[PDB]
Scaffold this active site. Structure first.
Site, PDB file in Angstrom:
ATOM      1  N   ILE A 157       0.023   9.736   8.259  1.00  0.00           N
ATOM      2  CA  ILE A 157      -0.525   8.819   9.268  1.00  0.00           C
ATOM      3  C   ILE A 157      -0.106   7.372   8.975  1.00  0.00           C
ATOM      4  O   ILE A 157       0.167   7.012   7.826  1.00  0.00           O
ATOM      5  CB  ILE A 157      -2.075   8.902   9.407  1.00  0.00           C
ATOM      6  CG1 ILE A 157      -2.797   8.374   8.168  1.00  0.00           C
ATOM      7  CG2 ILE A 157      -2.512  10.337   9.651  1.00  0.00           C
ATOM      8  CD1 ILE A 157      -4.345   8.175   8.400  1.00  0.00           C
ATOM      9  N   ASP A 159       0.811  -1.224   0.000  1.00  0.00           N
ATOM     10  CA  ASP A 159       0.000   0.000   0.000  1.00  0.00           C
ATOM     11  C   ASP A 159       0.842   1.269   0.000  1.00  0.00           C
ATOM     12  O   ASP A 159       1.236   1.817   1.053  1.00  0.00           O
ATOM     13  CB  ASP A 159      -0.972  -0.013   1.179  1.00  0.00           C
ATOM     14  CG  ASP A 159      -1.941   1.177   1.165  1.00  0.00           C
ATOM     15  OD1 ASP A 159      -1.740   2.091   0.326  1.00  0.00           O
ATOM     16  OD2 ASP A 159      -2.872   1.194   2.024  1.00  0.00           O
ATOM     17  N   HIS A 189       0.313   7.973   3.699  1.00  0.00           N
ATOM     18  CA  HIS A 189       1.155   7.420   4.757  1.00  0.00           C
ATOM     19  C   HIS A 189       2.617   7.779   4.635  1.00  0.00           C
ATOM     20  O   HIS A 189       3.407   7.500   5.537  1.00  0.00           O
ATOM     21  CB  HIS A 189       0.947   5.887   4.840  1.00  0.00           C
ATOM     22  CG  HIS A 189      -0.500   5.478   4.845  1.00  0.00           C
ATOM     23  ND1 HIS A 189      -1.383   5.895   5.818  1.00  0.00           N
ATOM     24  CD2 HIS A 189      -1.231   4.748   3.962  1.00  0.00           C
ATOM     25  CE1 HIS A 189      -2.593   5.409   5.547  1.00  0.00           C
ATOM     26  NE2 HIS A 189      -2.523   4.697   4.433  1.00  0.00           N
ATOM     27  N   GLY A 223      -3.873   2.215   8.725  1.00  0.00           N
ATOM     28  CA  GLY A 223      -4.780   1.517   9.665  1.00  0.00           C
ATOM     29  C   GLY A 223      -4.515   0.009   9.715  1.00  0.00           C
ATOM     30  O   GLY A 223      -4.450  -0.588  10.791  1.00  0.00           O
TER      31      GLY A 223
END
Ligand code: CL
Ligand code: CL
Ligand code: CL
Lengths: 288, 261
Positions: B181, B160, B165, B184
């Site tokens: 961030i 990903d 990110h 998740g």
């Protein structure tokens, strides 16, 4: 019975072309492997705003390894670099993703006599498959402790670089992580000396696994790219160094540099203690 | 978002991986030198184990989007241990579109036997099922696991590449965060590790299913603290929190696990 078999007739022996291919994941993974992080997104990301991925030039040790040629000489480990040396030379930037046709060669074999060392020199050449044009060269110098007296030529130890008698022009500290070998090994060197405390101690005698010598070399390589190459990978042409002592993951690597002559420098890497020199006789060519 | 698409399927996709991938994933979700079963393959006396959360990588439900995570949910269920190296035949389904809310399902089978290995359920926010019930008492366990500032740079090498990110520019100038961030799915993996240690006995196979909801973002470098309650035998519920600097921020909620003892 305790002698290493070393063919003194093998100098000049060569391997068939071997294709090395990689994608951006590999060059990204290598960068993080040698400790690149959020601070240099050109090496750790491919899709960040306004930043083309660059590839560290020390990546030549993975996509253009001189290692295959060792099998022509004997059966010793081509990657045991302690007391040995590694050199790379680049003729173009390495692309984030690509292929090379790599041929290797026994460059030299030196016999220092019975109860003295054997020295084996392996040379790698990597070319772009379509154009045949030369992209990277590598030189791996192996010291086989006490294994001389096999009927070879004595030879000449190459001249060590001259280190100016003054303070270094620059000291670049690069920390390493306690778990760094665990990521660095995913660029291909799975040898458990670097990852298994059992092995590191029970077979190799160390309190804990040691960081890969080539990882140290890549870390010094990042320091050189920053200080001398202006953070531009392509601006470092060649790097050579001798592996003097082991590093443990978590230790901070200080690369001390001396500009000697336009486009040339010398260096060492050490771990502040008196300091332990871990890379010595460093020599760098770079474009201003 | 055609609501006609419920029950639609992608043709099978072969997902293939070697040990490099599963070792990389484990380091991606924060395993290190103290977790040699997950981060090494050739350490003396230790066979490599694959963390069950690797299902999200080898059994991806996202093939089904074309047929159509913060605030979303993820579940997985495993029927066998995932092997360090292997492959799976994967088929994805649009399980439900709610009216925006999209629930995607994946199923991965052993290609030779046709036997089911893993299931994943991926809920994207753009009937809301029963939250688990949490008992009114102090957790049975709190498991704190650090993350590195570069955690997202490693985790993204499990597939990903979303600049959310990784790219400070994207994260702050287009996506509205103060800095990039952590994925998740990464936080989910870290909670996965917490579960394997506390409830699995360190044996990752022992954890059969994990489901949780993503409630607030995590930033790389933060310590993730997984609070766990054993409910019914072979079952538990959890949340994962970042300790406040203030009230603790809950980043995964409604967590439910099934395991074997
Ligand atoms: Cl960095
Ligand atoms: Cl590898
Ligand atoms: Cl990837």
């Amino acid at each position: 019975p305790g002698s290493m078999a070393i063919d003194p007739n093998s100098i000049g022996a060569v391997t068939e072309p071997m294709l090395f291919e990689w994608t951006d994941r590999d060059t990204l993974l290598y960068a993080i492997g040698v400790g690149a992080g959020t601070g240099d997104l050109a090496f750790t990301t491919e899709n960040s705003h306004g930043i083309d991925q660059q590839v560290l030039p020390t990546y030549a040790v993975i996509c253009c390894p001189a290692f295959g040629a060792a099998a022509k000489v004997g059966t010793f480990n081509p990657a045991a670099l302690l007391h040995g040396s590694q050199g790379i030379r680049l003729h173009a930037p390495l692309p984030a993703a690509g292929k090379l046709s790599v041929v290797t060669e026994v460059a030299d074999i030196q016999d220092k006599g019975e109860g003295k060392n054997a020295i084996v020199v392996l040379r790698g050449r990597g070319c772009d498959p379509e154009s045949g044009s030369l992209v990277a060269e590598t030189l791996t110098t192996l010291v086989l402790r006490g294994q001389g007296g096999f009927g070879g030529a004595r030879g000449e130890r190459p001249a060590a670089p001259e280190f100016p008698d003054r303070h270094p022009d620059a000291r670049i500290d690069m920390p390493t992580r306690e778990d760094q070998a665990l990521i660095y090994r995913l660029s291909g060197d799975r040898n458990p000396l670097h990852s298994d405390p059992w092995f590191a101690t029970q077979l190799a005698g160390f309190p804990k696994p040691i960081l890969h010598g080539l990882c140290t070399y890549g870390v010094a390589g990042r320091a050189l790219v920053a200080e001398l190459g202006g953070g531009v990978a392509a601006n470092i042409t060649s790097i050579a160094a001798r592996f003097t002592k082991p590093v443990f993951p978590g230790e901070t690597l200080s690369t001390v540099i001396w500009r000697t002559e336009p486009g040339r420098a010398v260096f060492r890497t050490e771990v502040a203690g008196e300091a332990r020199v871990v890379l010595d006789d460093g020599a760098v060519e770079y474009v201003a």
